[PDB]
Design a protein around this ligand. Structure first.
Ligand SMILES: CCCCCCCCCCCCCCCCCC(=O)OC[C@H](COP(=O)([O-])OCC(O)COP(=O)([O-])OC[C@@H](COC(=O)CCCCCCCCCCCCCCCCC)OC(=O)CCCCCCCCCCCCCCCCC)OC(=O)CCCCCCCCCCCCCCCCC
Ligand SMILES: CCCCCCCCCCCCCCCCCC(=O)OC[C@H](COP(=O)([O-])OCC(O)COP(=O)([O-])OC[C@@H](COC(=O)CCCCCCCCCCCCCCCCC)OC(=O)CCCCCCCCCCCCCCCCC)OC(=O)CCCCCCCCCCCCCCCCC
Ligand SMILES: CCCCCCCCCCCCCCCCCC(=O)OC[C@H](COP(=O)([O-])OCC[N+](C)(C)C)OC(=O)CCCCCCCCCCCCCCCCC
Ligand SMILES: CCCCCCCCCCCCCCCCCC(=O)OC[C@H](COP(=O)([O-])OCC[N+](C)(C)C)OC(=O)CCCCCCCCCCCCCCCCC
Ligand SMILES: CCCCCCCCCCCCCCCCCCCC(=O)O[C@H](COC(=O)CCCCCCCCCCCCCC)COP(=O)(O)OCCN
Ligand code: HEC
Ligand code: HEC
Ligand code: HEM
Ligand code: HEM
Ligand code: HEM
Ligand code: HEM
Ligand code: FES
Lengths: 244, 383, 55, 85, 383, 244
């Protein structure tokens, strides 16, 4: 297959979470949530994430309750069996922009924007692919490329023509921590946030792995000593043969 | 008389794990048998636990796996342990089978444990294939579709058999629910056959790296091989830890994190890595039925090693030419694996055919010729 | 008593009346008449706000 | 072809005296550094060709095949690709 | 040497089903062992097939069972076969245990097969209880609630253990999915223990109705007991047929055709019939923990029969007083069963307590006394 | 418990399907469907039954398709993702009168009319209980019974006070086969129909059971002959003992 059909392979960026002992940067996760909420969430759902998931990762209990309480969710029917709405709770999932696929495609010239909850695991490249894609729209497609109508050129996307246009531009978001919201900074934060959304156990998993590595290595060393200790009578055995 | 010998139940355990007389010179390649037992124990424990949280209905399957990852305490670990140990199971089984082929473990008087072993290997393939479908991601669905359609090649009744397997006209909910029930069962069948091949082996005992009798010099299984097994258990657990905790998705396909969609076809539909050599063999034959037969024959041909090896000596330790041929056979098997996941393009099409011919000619031509000539060289060379 | 749900406001102590075997609970939900041995159990509840309780 | 302890199926043994010492009396890691360096080197040297020859051959075959495949799917390889299909 | 003796695998089968030396005078009550093997095979085949169509999620479970009844080809038969064979399994196990108690099969040298047998019986109870919950009708839910709350009696940690078993604060979806996984597993564990009790038995062989050694006069298992087993297999299949095809719901509770509703409580919550005697024993003790202990003790007390039977003779064929006492013990056990499903009302409350005392006093008082006196009567009476 | 708390036990009526070899009367099943449709279906659903289920039991393919096609069911959303309706097909389930439990209870003074698809198996008594209940409303409750508000006296119902009033009266239905629609006739037909709905395999099951009974009985007889044949050398064995 041609390189174009594969898509250009994203660079390996030095993410904070790269590194056997490294967690996510939670300040970046919080900023990335804000990019999700203000830019991506217009077209993309994050359906696997509940408000409670943000608590103690990016937000306090009160902030997350406030986000939930601003929305309306379907309640159980009232006593005459008529539909009712309630305010959101921490157990509720973050609601998506569209009621069904047909509505989603109608708003995006036929293309269906995927749910982003697993996108960092569902694409080769992970955070690097998301970062490369969001920052990799050239001003002009390479001479000779004919884009289908409603397609945008992006070399990281296989085949080159993606139905999503460039969306991150310097200062589309105003970060609440005073960080300069440049295209690169926003792409880095939202890629970090999406990686967390795909693998929220990441920080705990790598710490438990460090404990396991240490214990298992010590046990491996001791098991070698013990095996050698027990085998030495066999290894050291000597014979004298006197032919009968 | 000691209780471990006198009581019939204790004596069965005693005969297999404690007083069992072993050769005194087993090397570390005799440790894969206990690693395979460990993988089987891990897969049973993790698999039964996943079954407590998994839902086999197609509307909920993929989401039940996400619930395991996200909500169940330690669910990420149990899921990653189960998925990675499936790969480790195949690494250990290829090592165990490679040991058996290099050291002549298939020769008399061990034809029966070897022949039951070949069935164990077939059951492991089926077990792993059904388990992979249960996620119900894109690779799950499309892998099930293409592999189950190979049955359509069976003449006359093939199409009918496929619809019967699927329980419908395509891979869907009926297929997923039956694969769950069979995936749960098949490991128990596999454990029984694993036990059978050991009981069959117990009549001759383990072979050894020199290929000679060990009846002259036996060691108890315990404590010697118990403590030697602990070393490879902890080495295995270190490898397990590195994948499960630090790189849990290295051995997987990202497309399996997209929910199954019968409309969109993924760019490349490949089996899991451990099935890749058999897929390359199937591609090599242009005919559909031809390809299926070749692929099955590639496993069943292991049953003829007892016949085609004409050597008067067991095993390769002292056979320089057989060792070279074995080296080429193993590397060819790895190349077939690689070719199983390339695109069907030049020049890999022809290369796959040449590697397929080499694979079969090992059994049918080279091993019978080389083993015949080495017999003559040992005789003449030592006169 | 056995584990039906009492119909409230009914009774003879005008609290709750279990229709199943006719046991009467009070406005405290204390048992007064009928086969029931105990008063209606109280869950573990706290007033987070003055307008919302969590159970 | 295997008996059990006391009747293992060995031909009669006679004339061999076997000696060994307690695991508590021995140094388990005696001669470890010599073994780790010189013994491993000897054992590895004697088996090296049986690994190197097939691995190097099949790696070369793969390398040539993968480089050709890559070249056929460039612009430069258009014509050769057309013939190859 | 014949192959069936020479080959180690064939020889294991040979030793159990063909050349196995049996007493020549086993009566028809020695046929329940093979009936229990048949029930286990039917439950495995029907159970694995139901698992291909059943969905363990609480939102779909009850409806998946209706889909089995209505849409799956022969699903009604597979479901009714599985549900009725659960009752037949208990009829056969009570008959088999009754045979064992009457004929002294628990005495030396058969204490080990009997003791493993008691664990088999506990596993059957757990297996059947979990399977009943899977329907997720009203009896399923409320039976699970009441039985699982008995664990709350365990001091200190009881409540925590219950929440851990449920996977939440009431019986719900987590409980149903875990019961599915364990219900699928437990029959395999049961088959292993069934095999263990037979291997333990093989050291002494079967006892026989006269209670004497049969080492003087043996018959091969095949063809004699093979063909005698076919008679009771066909008798069993006739009973099976009458329930499964003509009265499939006679042994069930209509409330299990109402979907589980945690709000509405059914009028009476009772276990399936085969658990009823143990439920009557539990009701007899007023204390919660007392009741649970008594109920467990009612099964574990079977383990002391080898000690409390002081007879110098094995079995009841020649013991008129022991036969009368055994008759009363069995009828009392059936009355306990009946009392397990009556309402907690006079005069059944006191009656249940008296029957409970009789149940335990058989093991602790009567059998030791009667067996002592009969020893003396045999000696003096034959002087 | 009091007999009243249990409910009066229904008589055993001679149903056509009683009898090891007897099927349902399908003409009664068809008439019972018409009682369901014109009387019960106002309050009670039959959610487990699809239109295809009637075909070749009570109705032809065309009649059942006509019943389905008169109703509207939810389709997949249109291309803008807006809701749409379609006419019914044979695969569709018979639709119930209420959208949820709350609506059902509001229409029945708090009581919830059960779905009737399994009611013949979900009640002790089966068809006899349904027949007894529908025909067993006395004109006057026995002297001394105090009914709760919205309750009707029926001795077959446990406790005596049922939230369902009498509904079958002579001539509420006009049967299409000219059968006089008396209370008793309609109760008998609808009870037969509901029994079929609970166990639609009934007719096939009992015929397969007849085949199994015959084969298994023959095999039982032959197994006795064969056992006796094989055992006769053991049974007939004789001994002569000469003490050494
Ligand atoms: C996966 C899960 C993790 C568990 C790990 C288990 C793996 C252990 C095992 O079976 O291999 C260890 C194993 C050491 O086992 P050993 O029992 O000491 O000797 C076994 C050989 O038969 C003895 O072979 P030898 O004495 O002829 O020594 C040969 C070996 C040298 O092996 C030494 O250890 C020295 O060196 C090589 O063959 C290297 C090839 C040269 C490449 C350049 O390593 C090898 O010898 C691998 C050679 C395979 C090629
Ligand atoms: C459940 C699944 C269905 C499969 C059916 C399996 C049932 C077969 C079985 O074990 O019982 C047949 C079994 C016939 O077995 P058998 O090998 O002819 O004799 C066993 C005894 O030694 C027979 O004892 P016996 O030689 O002293 O004869 C006594 C027997 C007459 O036994 C018969 O031959 C009938 O008559 C009675 O004990 C009737 C009790 C008096 C009531 C009045 O019938 C009975 O023994 C019934 C007596 C139980 C009380
Ligand atoms: C890659 C190619 C491997 C070729 C091996 C050639 C022999 C060698 O040097 O190995 C070292 C050793 C040589 O050991 P050895 O037992 O022959 O000799 C020991 C030393 N002497 C001769 C002095 C007594 O070989 C092994 O231990 C071989 C085990 C083979 C396992 C292969 C796994 C492949 C899986 C694919 C399955 C299909
Ligand atoms: C109901 C009460 C049954 C009492 C049985 C007393 C003996 C009798 O008449 O049986 C006939 C026969 C008598 O057989 P027998 O073997 O004692 O005598 C044969 C004839 N003579 C003495 C001449 C050699 O008993 C059986 O076969 C008894 C088996 C008992 C099975 C009980 C099942 C109950 C399950 C509850 C489990 C807890
Ligand atoms: C699992 C449960 C096992 C119990 C089996 C009992 C009857 C089940 C058979 C199904 C059935 O309804 O068959 C009927 C006949 O029964 C019969 O004639 C069957 C009774 C035979 C008794 C068992 C004999 C062997 C069965 C088990 C062997 C299975 C594996 C061996 C290869 C009529 O059905 P139909 O006649 O319309 O059927 C179409 C072919 N004309
Ligand atoms: C107004 C529309 C719109 C906005 C705003 C938007 N997207 Fe998208 N996005 C799409 C559409 C449409 C697709 C599908 C493109 C296709 O498949 O051709 C898509 C696809 C993607 C993909 C998958 C590309 C692939 O490999 O399949 C990722 C990752 C993605 N978007 C992330 C983002 C992130 C991160 C943001 C913003 C911070 C964002 N999107 C903003 C419309 C949008
Ligand atoms: C307009 C209301 C209404 C009509 C018409 C109606 N029912 Fe009911 N039915 C109910 C209500 C309400 C209940 C619940 C009664 C209760 O539980 O107290 C009920 C309960 C039942 C029960 C169950 C009683 C029990 O044991 O729980 C059956 C059976 C039944 N109906 C059958 C029928 C049949 C058959 C028809 C007509 C041919 C019918 N119903 C007509 C309202 C109705
Ligand atoms: C030899 C033993 C087994 C092997 C090789 C095996 C292999 C696999 C594989 C490859 C998968 C797909 C994993 C993934 O990528 O997510 C899987 C999934 C699964 N297996 Fe197994 N398995 C085995 C035993 C069992 C057993 C005994 C159970 C008991 C039920 C079981 C239950 C499951 C379940 C529920 C899933 C789906 C959830 C998931 O994907 O993690 N497995 N298995
Ligand atoms: C679940 C998979 C398996 C398990 C748990 C298992 C386990 C074992 C164990 C414990 C031994 C004895 C110790 C050892 O030599 O390593 C052994 C020996 C053997 N196994 Fe396996 N095995 C499995 C699969 C296979 C397969 C797939 C084959 C063949 C294709 C096979 C063929 C043999 C043979 C021939 C031996 C005797 C080797 C010898 O000692 O010379 N086994 N196995
Ligand atoms: C000793 C063996 C077994 C016994 C005593 C047993 C018992 C039961 C019982 C009592 C039920 C409730 C049946 C009902 O009323 O509907 C049931 C349901 C079930 N059993 Fe089993 N079972 C056994 C083996 C198995 C096995 C091996 C499986 C394999 C999965 C299994 C799968 C099921 C399923 C899926 C259900 C629920 C669907 C249904 O109710 O029919 N069972 N079992
Ligand atoms: C799955 C359940 C079971 C199966 C398949 C089974 C099977 C058998 C079989 C085939 C035999 C030999 C033939 C016979 O005497 O009937 C036997 C003997 C025996 N079983 Fe069981 N059994 C089961 C459960 C139990 C239980 C619950 C007990 C004890 C509480 C028990 C205790 C025994 C004893 C003591 C014997 C030896 C009796 C004798 O021959 O004298 N078994 N069983
Ligand atoms: S159930 Fe409440 S009064 Fe008896």
């Amino acid at each position: 297959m041609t390189a174009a059909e594969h898509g250009l392979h994203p660079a390996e960026y030095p993410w904070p979470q790269n590194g056997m002992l490294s967690t996510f940067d939670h300040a970046s996760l919080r900023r990335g949530y804000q990019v999700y909420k203000e830019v991506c969430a217009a077209c993309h759902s994050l359906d696997r994430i509940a408000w409670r998931n943000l608590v103690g990762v990016t937000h306090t209990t009160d902030e997350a309750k406030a986000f939930a309480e601003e929305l309306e969710y379907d309640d159980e029917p009232d006593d005459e069996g008529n539909p009712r709405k309630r305010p959101g709770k921490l157990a509720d999932y973050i609601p998506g922009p569209y009621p069904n696929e047909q509505a989603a495609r109608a708003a995006n010239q036929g293309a269906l924007p995927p749910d982003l909850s697993l996108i960092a695991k569902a694409r080769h490249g992970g955070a690097d692919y998301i970062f490369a894609l969001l920052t990799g729209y050239p001003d002009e497609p390479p001479a000779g490329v004919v884009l289908a109508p409603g397609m945008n050129y992006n070399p990281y996307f296989p085949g080159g023509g993606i139905g999503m246009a460039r969306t991150l531009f310097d200062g589309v978001v105003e970060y609440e921590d005073g960080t300069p919201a440049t295209t690169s900074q926003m792409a880095k934060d939202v890629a970090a946030f999406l990686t967390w959304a795909a693998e929220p156990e990441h920080d705990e998993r790598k710490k438990l792995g460090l404990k396991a590595i240490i214990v298992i290595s010590a046990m491996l060393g001791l098991s070698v000593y013990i095996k050698k200790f027990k085998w030495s009578p066999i290894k050291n055995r000597k014979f004298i043969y006197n032919p009968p | 008389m000691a209780l471990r010998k006198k009581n019939s139940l204790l004596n069965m355990a005693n005969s297999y794990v404690l007083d069992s007389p072993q050769p005194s010179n087993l090397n570390y390649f005799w440790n894969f048998g206990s690693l395979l037992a460990l993988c089987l124990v891990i897969q049973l424990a993790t698999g039964i636990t996943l079954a407590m949280h998994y839902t086999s209905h197609a509307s909920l399957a993929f989401d039940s796996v996400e619930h395991i990852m996200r909500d169940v305490n330690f669910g990420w670990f149990i899921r990653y342990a189960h998925a990675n140990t499936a790969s480790f199971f195949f690494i250990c089984i290829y090592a165990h089978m490679g040991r058996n082929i290099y050291y002549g473990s298939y020769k008399t008087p061990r034809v029966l444990p070897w022949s039951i072993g070949v069935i164990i290997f077939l059951l492991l393939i089926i077990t792993a294939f059904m388990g992979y479908v249960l996620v119900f991601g894109q690779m799950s669905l499309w892998g099930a579709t293409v592999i189950c359609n190979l049955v359509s090649a069976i003449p006359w009744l093939g199409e009918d058999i496929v619809h019967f397997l699927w329980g419908g006209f395509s891979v869907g909910n009926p297929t997923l629910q039956r694969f769950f029930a069979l995936h749960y069962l098949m490991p128990f069948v596999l454990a029984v056959f694993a036990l059978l091949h050991l009981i069959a082996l117990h009549t001759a005992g383990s072979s050894n790296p020199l290929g000679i009798t060990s009846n002259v010099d036996k060691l108890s299984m315990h404590p010697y091989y118990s403590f030697k097994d602990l070393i490879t258990v902890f080495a295995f657990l270190l490898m397990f830890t590195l994948f499960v905790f630090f790189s849990p998705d290295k051995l997987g396909h990202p497309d399996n994190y997209i929910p199954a969609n019968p409309m969109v076809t993924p760019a490349s539909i490949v089996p899991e890595w451990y099935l890749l050599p058999f897929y390359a063999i199937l591609r090599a034959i242009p005919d559909k039925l031809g390809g299926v037969i070749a692929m099955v024959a590639a496993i069943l041909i292991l049953l003829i090693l007892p016949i085609v090896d004409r050597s008067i000596i067991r095993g390769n330790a002292f056979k320089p030419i057989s060792k070279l041929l074995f080296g080429f056979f193993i590397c060819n098997f790895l190349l077939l694996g690689v070719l199983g996941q390339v695109h069907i393009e030049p020049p890999f099409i022809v290369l796959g055919q040449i590697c397929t011919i080499f694979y079969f000619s090992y059994f049918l031509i080279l091993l019978p010729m080389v083993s015949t000539i080495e017999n003559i060289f040992f005789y003449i060379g030592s006169l | 008593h056995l584990g039906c749900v009492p119909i409230g406001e009914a009774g003879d102590f005008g609290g709750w009346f279990c229709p199943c075997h006719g046991s009467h609970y009070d406005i405290s939900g204390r048992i007064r008449r009928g086969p029931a041995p105990l008063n209606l159990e109280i869950p573990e509840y706290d007033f987070a706000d003055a307008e919302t309780l969590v159970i | 072809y295997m008996g059990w302890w006391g009747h293992m199926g060995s031909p009669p043994q006679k004339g061999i005296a076997g000696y060994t010492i307690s695991p508590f009396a021995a140094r388990p890691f005696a001669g470890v550094v010599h073994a780790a360096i010189f013994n491993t080197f000897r054992r590895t040297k004697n088996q090296a060709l049986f690994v190197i020859l097939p691995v190097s051959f099949f790696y070369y075959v793969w390398t040539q095949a993968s480089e050709k495949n890559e070249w056929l799917y460039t612009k430069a390889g258009r014509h050769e690709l057309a013939k190859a299909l």
